[PDB]
Design a protein around this ligand. Structure first.
Ligand code: CDL
Ligand code: PLX
Ligand code: PEE
Ligand code: PEE
Ligand code: 8Q1
Lengths: 178, 104, 84, 88, 124, 175, 274, 63, 70, 459, 128
């Protein structure tokens, strides 16, 4: 979610993803903690005796049959965390997330209450206004010719600089605003 | 649009789309609020066969049970006044044929 | 006013595999030449008030003793009252 | 809800508590900055199991792309703080 | 059920069809034929407006049960004697229906035995 | 209630049982009606008495309009627009009155069904018969005319009906 | 038609509930099965009995959802029963209320569900109806007992399976009083209502002893078989699911196909041709 | 005090208004309020007429 | 509205004696009601009238004649 | 009836002589007063009509349409106040003059005791709306929309003029009273068939009938907000009104000449309701919904039963109000986003809650939720069709299902979900827009209390 | 040896079951790099416009404009009368109409014949 993705997944990434999926779906199958621990250790061992395979063709036929076996035994109703993309509260609080620019449209009588908050907000807006003019030039000078190759942004390299394109990352509404 | 990566940081998180990427012709048909094509644990044909078999078997068995109804070993209920002729329909100016019940 | 009492984490060395089905798993695992590395991470589920279990029928008979005693007392009282 | 707000100090304690119960890691040597691969000599599978343990401890799921590059206890603490938006 | 198994697995003709019982005259057995008695008349059974399915030969006990429930309202366990009386009358009615079913079955069996004996005598 | 005529809307004498308690236990129903009366019916009755005396202090009357009889479409010339107009308005008024008559009989039927309780199938035969007769007459008079109905269309329908009746009667008499 | 629809509905929904993991989903499928039973009661020409069942089901199903919601709130918005562990002693009031409501649902004698479900089964047994619908009603009763056993066993009997930070708290007068009012209901309202209403149907006074007991035997058989099959999850062996389990867990595959085949065709046709 | 004022403003006023509207306006027209006639059993007396419904036929009372 | 209960982190949560006595009380009343109702109304479960046996009925009771009268 | 005609005529001088900054206030106030005066037409009598003079007469079918026509103008001025802010005084006065002229023609069209005067005003309405569409429209497709709207109408309407003059030469008059009283059956002949077609096409083209509806999405999408309101609410009903006037001389031919149009409308409501499910534009969706509702109205008029006519009148009034409100809401969104695309601006319930509840109520009236007058018209037409033939219930039920589906789809896509991140100019809803929504919606829920006012002359 | 999974139109093939993702080629790697480069260029442009404090409007998306224009305004100029178009148009625009005409005409003819025979029992059929 936070880290930028690459052009592809290497073999070790696929191995680790299959390991995670297998363990999670096994936990979904064997519910009790002791049974799950036993069968997870057995799965790790069954996942381990092929660790030192050297040639890549065998290591590709392997984990390709394993994916088929996983798809056969995947427990069509796996356990999902409540806030996960399949969970029962995945986007429950997404309707309470209000943008920060909405504060700009408040009536002056509304802004009369919470004066300290709006003073701090004005300080933040001034900081953003200067930092933007700095970071545009930083990004223009740092980007390779022909445009970016990955979705990676560089850190601020000077003292008074701020990371380029920082406003909409640090000014997120909240995880649960209300 | 449901089977796109849910963990990627899209520009449109709910639609799972990026600014400037081609939209697709039938975007409004795949919006996670409508028909999705995500792979299922069971094959489509297997699911179709199982559902159709269950429904057809239930229909056939209900028809069979209609052929072979269940009941208790008793006679029909007896209602006193000419099978309650007046209380069901009336017509008191006709003098219906007297039907009477047998006491055992 | 909420629940702010500065709760402290218990000692990490209390959790032992001993006396729990985690021993059964560990012995069966060592029989094939393996060991569990996360066994003590789950030991808290068998240590405190979670150590004693209740059967299904025992769960269903949650208040049978006092109800039976009250029923016996009531039937005795009715027997005494009626015969007069 | 009635859930206590978690704090940075609290997250650090629970991460170290979970790591201490990992018997493959010596508890008297592990520290906040101790790298899993080198300072503890762990495997990739061990790191992914550690990530699973943290997920089950804190009740949420770290995405795989973000989880595969969490190599220090301080890294995990900072990631959890970023997710739960804990500034203290 | 066993009657269902006998009819649907054995000889259907040897067992009655419940929709069309009886198939034999009421006087076929004996000539006495004591008539069924109604206690509740047309008018007051109508005034009590019981139900159309409740206007059977046990109606009078239902009348008393409703009257008891009406008079002794607050203490709704007052009148069990009349409820038990109505239940017993309905039990007797169901037993009478069972006796009718058994009489029909045995009449059919005797008629079948008669026609097979007549056929055997004609053949011999 | 002197507000409506009992003959158009008949009602049975309303025989009701007398309270015959069999147990000394006090039913909450009687107490509840006593408190309800004391706390609701009396203030409402006093307010109504005040309102009625205020109304009686200022009494005035309104009248039901009388409509004369006018020659109908059967005695109207082919192109005489004025007589046709008057006959058409009279026919429309008669149609509305017939609709209201059917409504009255339907209300009678509904009240009978609700009142007779479980014995409506036998104790409402009279109302069903009256409604059947009235509905048959109404359907013969006014059905199938369409949205653009008129007195001429009704007259044509009636003429065709009596032509069929005359043909049938002639066939039966000479059969 | 009504009788057949009710029978198929109650059987299918009980079968789907048999293997669900979301507590709310299990209770919802139980509600659907009870509605199918109500429709069956309508089909045998017993309207007042169906209305009485509606009245009793109100009480005990509302309280069952109450307890489910209490469990969910106390467990940090967790609804999966795979992470519900030992709650028999952690939450005593939720446990006792859920046990009472489950016993009322399954037709424990002289409870609120007795005075409707028992007579419904009695009337189905002694009526001229389909054999298949009768068999499905009996199997649905057995499966009702079975999934009640599933909920109780998987949510209240084992070792704790929830995250280590324990936030269990029942001590709120609002929740306790709201639960206890429906508890008193689910205990006594069936008896009170049954002896306070006038008779509006003929009873089944005489009946074979085995047929009079059929509901009890069916419920007890469901209880015992479900408990025996659930106790085998403690065994240290792992086996892959069968076809019947897959059919039951994916809801007869009805939600998949019927939400992908027609809608895709209807939507595609509308844009492409019209 | 809160419960008393609540019951006055939320129960008594609506019931007064509805009772007035039903008694003096709704029942002014015919058939607006129709009551199912009370059940009559043998042995009851009628308030308006004062007569007594005759008893039953004296069925043989045993068990 | 309730009381103050604090989290435990891997221990059994605190229980008030009030909730324990309340749950035990309600379970006790449920079981007492079941037993009392069974004692006073047992026929509601087993039945009150015996089931007649069709075979026991004599041939004359049903008016059955062995091809003799006709 | 001149007590309404003269003040409307009077509005033009007032607008021209008004101060550069006082035109909207005067126009709105005096149009509201005229609308209040128009309410006296609702006091109809169960007998013939309110025959004011030889030229104009009012009926229980004309009165609700006249009241709606007079009530619309203040709302159109309120909606047009926003996007004409940067407009010169002369051109603003010209726009208000166009609205006043359109209202005058519409008012004089419904009374119109004679059929030729009705036709003259019925086609006079075509000019101001064409000018409004082709002058004050944003996109470049407004010219094509104007051409389609003009030529469909005129091609459908000229044979009507020929038929009308022929009928007057044969019968001697075209006064509606004489036509109704001296009506005679239409024989089964080719000439009578073509007279029927000429009398029918002009009004079938502007409902519009399915297949003859291609001008409507164009003319409604590309017109300004006031143009869209007047097109959807009143200009579509004219043909409906016309049919209930002319079908008195088309019997008994209508008994079988209606089969092609009955089949066309019955299938076309389904087709257009399904089209609404896959639409990338809000205004196009509302226009196709209007097409479906008017197809139902066509079926009602062709069935020719009293319940059909009552349902048709109620449905026209309810649809006018509902579609005007829907177009106003869509324009409120458009004036902020400037895109008119349904999928772009999302999650607006978070930012504009009162706009969200206005959207909810408008959609609910579009769903035909009882006891709203939309449901009353729908149910009366459905019952009449069921009496006509029992198989129609399949089509009507499918239409109801699809209508609910696409209405709630429109609500969910625009109001629910997560807001678009990069749209940061979603200003709070103005008091003018909220007042416009309230003045749209309160008459509907007030009319649901007195349905007989809008159930037509056959009540 | 386990039963194989057969994909369908509404139940597609999982990524982990694609034989393509297990056939690795340098061409595949360079194509993935090109796709990521295009996507990152688009993301960079969008975020440069998005974080601008001076922008106070809607970031116009040419992709959405192209989608809507192709859906609505680009249909007819690219239409050609072919056997497929002619056949599908005739079917889907004529067949339902004539089918419903046949159904309703038959139903109404039977109803009219029954009414003329008098054997329909239209008692209490007052409102129509
Ligand atoms: C007059 C005589 C009266 C006496 C009658 C007889 C007395 C008793 C006799 C006993 C009869 C059976 C009792 C046992 C029930 C079976 C339970 C069991 O073992 O399941 C586990 C077992 C395997 O378990 P697993 O896959 O390893 O589960 C993984 C883990 O356990 C994962 O586990 P989990 O934790 O996720 O969840 C566990 C869950 C998940 O387990 C499941 O998957 C449940 C699925 C099976 C349960 C269904 C039972 C009843 C089915 C009725 C279906 C109606 C017809 C359907 C037609 C289908 C059409 C194709 O299981 C349960 O919760 C408990 C199971 C339910 C048992 C309790 C109630 C049943 C007892 C009552 C049955 C009959 C008595 C009626 C009483 C009245 C008498 C009239 O399931 C099976 O093997 C299925 C066995 C029966 C299936 C029948 C359907 C086969 C259809 C094939 C085609 C046939 C031809 C059709 C022709 C069509 C032509 C087109
Ligand atoms: C495209 C979107 C919609 C646009 C508008 C569509 C509506 C226009 C449809 C016109 C309605 C029907 C027109 C004529 C119908 C007459 C009845 C006919 O269909 O039935 C048979 C008629 O027989 C044959 O049909 C002869 C006519 C054949 C040639 C006419 C062309 C029919 C299809 C044309 C459709 C084209 C529509 C667009 C035109 C621009 C009955 O034969 P018969 O009982 O002996 O004669 C009865 C008539 N009499 C008594 C006056 C003599
Ligand atoms: C007649 C029905 C005609 C078909 C209607 C098609 C409607 C198409 C447009 C609907 C909008 C699309 C939509 O809403 O998405 C489908 C939506 C999403 O699916 P989810 O499972 O919720 O996915 C969530 C997890 N991702 O699912 C649906 O709502 C589809 C529902 C379609 C039902 C159609 C099948 C009905 C058939 C009924 C036949 C039996 C009748 C009953 C007999 C009664 C006895 C007399
Ligand atoms: C939205 C576009 C629709 C365009 C409008 C199409 C309407 C079609 C209706 C026909 C138009 C002219 C009808 C004539 C007006 C009525 C007058 C009349 O009925 O008199 C007839 C005249 O009848 C005709 O002349 C009709 C000839 C038609 C000429 C134009 C043909 C146009 C196309 C015809 C086929 C399609 C018709 C329906 C198309 C529907 C729209 C798609 C005979 O009178 P007499 O001769 O004096 O008396 C009989 C004894 N001598
Ligand atoms: C219940 C659901 C069904 C479960 C089915 C799952 C069954 C899957 C098991 C099948 C066997 C396999 O894994 S197929 C084996 C695939 N081939 C290889 O693994 C060869 C080389 N592996 C590596 O290099 C990795 O990186 C590694 C060293 C492992 C880690 O690296 P780290 O040092 O960076 O942690």
């Amino acid at each position: 979610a936070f880290s930028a993705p690459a052009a592809y997944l290497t073999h070790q990434q696929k191995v680790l993803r299959l390991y995670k999926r297998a363990l999670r779906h096994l936990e979904s199958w064997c519910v009790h903690r002791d049974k799950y621990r036993y069968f997870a250790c057995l799965m790790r061992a069954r996942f381990d005796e092929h660790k030192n395979e050297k040639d890549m063709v065998k290591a590709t036929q392997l984990l390709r049959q394993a994916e088929e076996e996983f798809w056969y035994g995947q427990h069509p109703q796996p356990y999902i965390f409540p806030e996960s993309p399949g969970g029962t509260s995945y986007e429950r609080y997404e309707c309470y997330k209000v943008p920060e620019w909405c504060l700009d449209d408040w009536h002056p009588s509304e802004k009369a209450m919470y004066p300290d908050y709006f003073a701090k907000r004005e300080q933040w807006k001034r900081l953003r206004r200067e930092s933007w003019e700095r970071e545009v030039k930083q990004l223009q000078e740092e980007t390779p010719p022909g445009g970016p190759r990955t979705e990676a942004l560089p850190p601020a390299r000077k003292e008074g600089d701020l990371p380029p394109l920082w406003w909409h990352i640090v000014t997120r509404p909240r995880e649960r605003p209300m | 649009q449901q089977e796109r990566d849910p963990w990627y940081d899209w520009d449109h998180p709910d639609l799972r789309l990026n600014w400037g990427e081609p939209i697709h012709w039938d975007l409004d048909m795949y919006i996670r609020n409508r028909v999705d094509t995500s792979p299922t644990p069971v094959s489509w044909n297997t699911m179709c066969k199982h559902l159709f078999g269950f429904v057809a078997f239930m229909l056939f068995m209900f028809w069979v049970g209609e052929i072979y109804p269940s009941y208790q070993p008793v006679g029909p209920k007896q209602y006193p006044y000419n099978d309650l002729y007046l209380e069901r329909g009336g017509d008191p100016t006709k003098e219906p044929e007297p039907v009477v019940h047998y006491e055992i | 006013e909420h629940g702010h009492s500065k709760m402290e984490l218990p000692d990490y060395k209390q959790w032992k595999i001993e006396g729990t089905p985690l021993e059964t798993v560990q012995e069966k695992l060592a029989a094939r030449g393996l060991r569990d590395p996360w066994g003590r991470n789950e030991a808290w589920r068998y240590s405190g008030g979670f150590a004693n279990n209740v059967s299904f029928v025992g769960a269903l008979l949650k208040g049978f003793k006092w109800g039976f005693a009250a029923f016996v007392v009531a039937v005795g009282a009715e027997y005494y009252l009626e015969s007069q | 809800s009635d859930a206590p707000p978690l704090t940075l100090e609290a997250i650090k304690d629970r991460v170290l508590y979970v790591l201490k119960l990992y018997d493959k890691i010596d508890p008297e040597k592990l520290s906040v900055n101790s790298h899993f691969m080198k300072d503890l000599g762990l495997d990739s599978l061990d790191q992914v199991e550690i990530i699973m343990a943290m997920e089950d401890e804190f009740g949420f799921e770290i995405p795989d792309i973000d989880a595969e590059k969490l190599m220090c206890p301080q890294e995990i603490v900072d990631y959890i703080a970023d997710k739960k938006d804990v500034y203290e | 059920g066993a009657h269902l198994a006998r009819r649907y697995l054995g000889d259907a003709s040897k067992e009655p069809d419940p929709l069309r019982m009886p198939t034999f005259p009421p006087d076929y057995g004996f000539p006495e034929r004591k008539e069924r008695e109604m206690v509740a008349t047309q008018q007051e059974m109508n005034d009590a407006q019981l139900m159309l399915q409740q206007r059977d030969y046990c109606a009078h006990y239902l009348i008393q049960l409703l009257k008891c429930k009406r008079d002794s309202f607050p203490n709704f366990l007052a009148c069990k004697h009349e409820q038990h009386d109505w239940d017993y009358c309905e039990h007797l009615d169901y037993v009478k229906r069972m006796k009718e079913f058994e009489r029909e079955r045995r009449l059919l069996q005797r008629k079948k035995r008669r026609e097979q004996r007549e056929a055997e005598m004609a053949r011999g | 209630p002197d507000s409506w005529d009992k003959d158009v809307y008949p009602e049975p004498p309303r025989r009701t049982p007398a309270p015959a308690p069999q147990t000394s236990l006090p039913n909450p129903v009687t107490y509840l009606t006593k408190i309800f009366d004391l706390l609701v019916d009396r203030p409402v009755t006093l307010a109504r008495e005040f309102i009625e005396q205020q109304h009686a202090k200022n009494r005035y009357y309104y009248y039901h309009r009388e409509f004369r009889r006018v020659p109908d479409i059967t005695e109207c010339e082919e192109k005489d627009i004025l007589c046709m107009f008057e006959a058409e308005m009279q026919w429309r008024r008669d149609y509305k009155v017939d609709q209201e008559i059917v409504n009255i009989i339907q209300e009678r039927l509904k009240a009978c069904q609700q009142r007779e309780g479980e014995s409506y199938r036998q104790n409402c035969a009279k109302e069903l018969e009256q409604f059947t007769q009235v509905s048959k007459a109404f359907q013969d008079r006014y059905s199938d005319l369409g949205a653009h109905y008129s007195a001429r269309k009704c007259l044509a329908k009636q003429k065709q009906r009596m032509l069929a009746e005359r043909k049938a009667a002639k066939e039966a008499a000479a059969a | 038609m009504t009788l057949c629809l009710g029978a198929i509905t109650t059987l299918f929904t009980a079968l789907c509930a048999i293997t669900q993991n979301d507590i709310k989903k299990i209770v919802a499928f139980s509600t659907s099965s009870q509605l199918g039973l109500m429709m069956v009661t309508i089909g045998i020409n017993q309207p007042h009995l169906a209305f009485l069942h509606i009245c009793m089901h109100a009480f005990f199903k509302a309280m069952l959802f109450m307890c489910s919601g209490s469990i969910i709130h106390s467990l940090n918005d967790e609804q999966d029963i795979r992470k519900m562990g030992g709650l028999y002693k952690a939450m005593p009031f939720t446990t006792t209320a859920l046990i009472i409501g489950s016993l009322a649902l399954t037709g424990m004698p002289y409870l609120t569900g007795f005075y409707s479900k028992d007579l419904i089964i009695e009337a189905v047994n002694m009526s001229y109806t389909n054999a298949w619908a009768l068999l499905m009603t009996l199997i649905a009763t057995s499966l009702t007992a079975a999934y009640s056993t599933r909920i109780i066993f998987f949510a209240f009997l084992g070792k704790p399976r929830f995250p280590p930070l324990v936030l269990i708290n029942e001590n709120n007068p609002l929740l306790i009083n709201s639960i206890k009012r429906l508890l008193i209901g689910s205990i006594f309202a069936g008896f009170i209502i049954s002896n306070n209403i006038p008779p509006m149907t003929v009873p089944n006074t005489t009946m074979p002893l085995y047929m009079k007991m059929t509901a009890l035997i069916v419920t007890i058989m469901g209880f015992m078989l479900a408990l025996e099959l659930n106790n085998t999850t403690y065994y240290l062996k792992f086996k892959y699911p069968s076809q019947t389990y897959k059919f039951s867990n994916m809801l007869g595959y009805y939600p998949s196909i019927m939400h992908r085949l027609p809608t895709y065709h209807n939507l595609s046709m509308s844009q492409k041709s019209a | 005090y809160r419960h008393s004022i609540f019951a006055v403003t939320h129960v008594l006023i609506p019931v007064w208004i509805i009772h007035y509207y039903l008694k003096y306006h709704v029942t002014a027209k015919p058939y607006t309020v129709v009551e199912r006639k009370p059940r009559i059993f043998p042995g009851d007396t009628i308030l308006e007429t004062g007569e007594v419904i005759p008893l039953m036929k004296e069925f043989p009372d045993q068990h | 509205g309730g009381v103050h209960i604090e989290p435990r982190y891997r221990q059994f949560p605190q229980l008030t004696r009030s909730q324990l006595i309340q749950a035990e009380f309600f379970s006790a009343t449920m079981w007492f009601w079941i037993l009392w109702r069974f004692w006073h109304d047992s026929d509601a479960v087993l039945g009150h009238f015996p089931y007649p046996d069709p075979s026991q009925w004599t041939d004359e009771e049903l008016g059955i004649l062995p091809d003799d009268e006709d | 009836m001149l007590k309404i005609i003269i003040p409307t005529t009077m509005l033009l001088p007032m607008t021209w002589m008004s101060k550069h900054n006082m035109i909207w206030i005067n126009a709105t106030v005096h149009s509201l007063l005229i609308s209040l005066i128009s309410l006296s037409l609702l006091n109809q009598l169960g007998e013939n009509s309110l025959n004011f003079s030889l030229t104009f007469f009012s009926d229980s079918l004309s009165a609700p349409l006249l009241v709606l026509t007079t009530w619309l103008l203040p709302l159109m001025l309120m909606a047009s106040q926003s996007h004409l802010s940067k407009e010169t005084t002369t051109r603003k006065k010209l726009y208000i003059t166009m609205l006043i002229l359109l209202q005058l023609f519409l008012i004089m069209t419904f009374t119109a005791t004679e059929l030729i005067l009705f036709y003259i005003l019925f086609e006079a309405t075509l000019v101001p709306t064409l000018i409004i569409i082709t002058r004050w429209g944003n996109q470049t497709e407004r010219l094509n929309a104007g051409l389609y709207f003009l030529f469909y109408t005129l091609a459908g309407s000229l044979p009507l003029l020929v038929a009308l003059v022929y009928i007057q030469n044969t019968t001697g008059s075209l006064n509606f009273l004489i036509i109704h009283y001296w009506s005679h059956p239409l024989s089964n002949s080719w000439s009578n068939i073509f007279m029927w077609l000429a009398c029918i096409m002009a009004f079938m083209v502007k409902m519009p009938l399915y297949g003859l509806h291609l001008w409507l999405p164009k003319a409604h999408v590309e017109a300004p907000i006031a143009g869209s309101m007047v097109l959807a609410a009143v200009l579509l009903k004219l043909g409906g009104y016309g049919m209930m006037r002319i079908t008195t001389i088309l019997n008994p031919l209508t008994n079988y000449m209606a089969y092609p149009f009955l089949m066309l409308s019955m299938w076309g409501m389904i087709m257009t309701s399904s089209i609404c499910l896959r639409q990338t534009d809000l205004k196009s969706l509302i226009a196709y919904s209007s097409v479906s509702h008017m197809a139902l109205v066509i079926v009602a008029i062709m069935i020719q039963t009293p319940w059909s006519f009552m349902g048709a009148t109620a449905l026209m009034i309810a649809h006018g109000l509902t579609s005007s409100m829907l177009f106003c809401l869509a324009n409120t969104n458009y004036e902020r986003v400037h895109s008119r695309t349904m999928i772009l601006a999302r999650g607006l319930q978070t930012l504009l809650p009162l706009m969200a509840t206005w959207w909810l109520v408008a959609s609910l009236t579009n769903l035909a939720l009882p006891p709203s007058i939309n449901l009353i018209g729908e149910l009366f037409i459905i019952t009449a069709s069921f009496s006509w033939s029992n198989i129609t219930i399949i089509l009507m039920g499918m239409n109801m299902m699809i209508t609910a589906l696409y209405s709630l789809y429109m609500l969910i896509t625009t109001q629910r979900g997560k807001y678009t991140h990069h749209i940061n100019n979603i200003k709070p809803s103005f008091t003018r827009e909220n007042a416009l929504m309230a003045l749209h919606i309160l008459p509907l829920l007030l009319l649901t209390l007195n349905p007989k006012m809008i159930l037509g002359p056959l009540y | 040896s386990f039963p194989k999974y057969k994909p369908s139109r509404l139940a597609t093939l999982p990524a982990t079951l694609d034989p393509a993702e297990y056939d690795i080629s340098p061409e595949t790697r360079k194509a993935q790099a090109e796709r990521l480069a295009i996507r990152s260029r688009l993301k960079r442009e969008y975020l440069l416009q998005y974080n601008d404090p001076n922008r106070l409007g809607v970031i116009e998306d040419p992709a959405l404009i192209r989608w809507t224009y192709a859906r609505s305004a680009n249909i007819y100029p690219n239409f050609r009368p072919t056997p497929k178009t002619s056949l599908l148009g005739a079917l889907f625009g004529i067949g339902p109409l004539f089918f419903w005409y046949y159904v309703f005409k038959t139903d109404r003819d039977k109803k009219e014949k029954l009414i003329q025979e008098g054997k329909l029992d239209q008692t209490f059929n007052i409102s129509y």
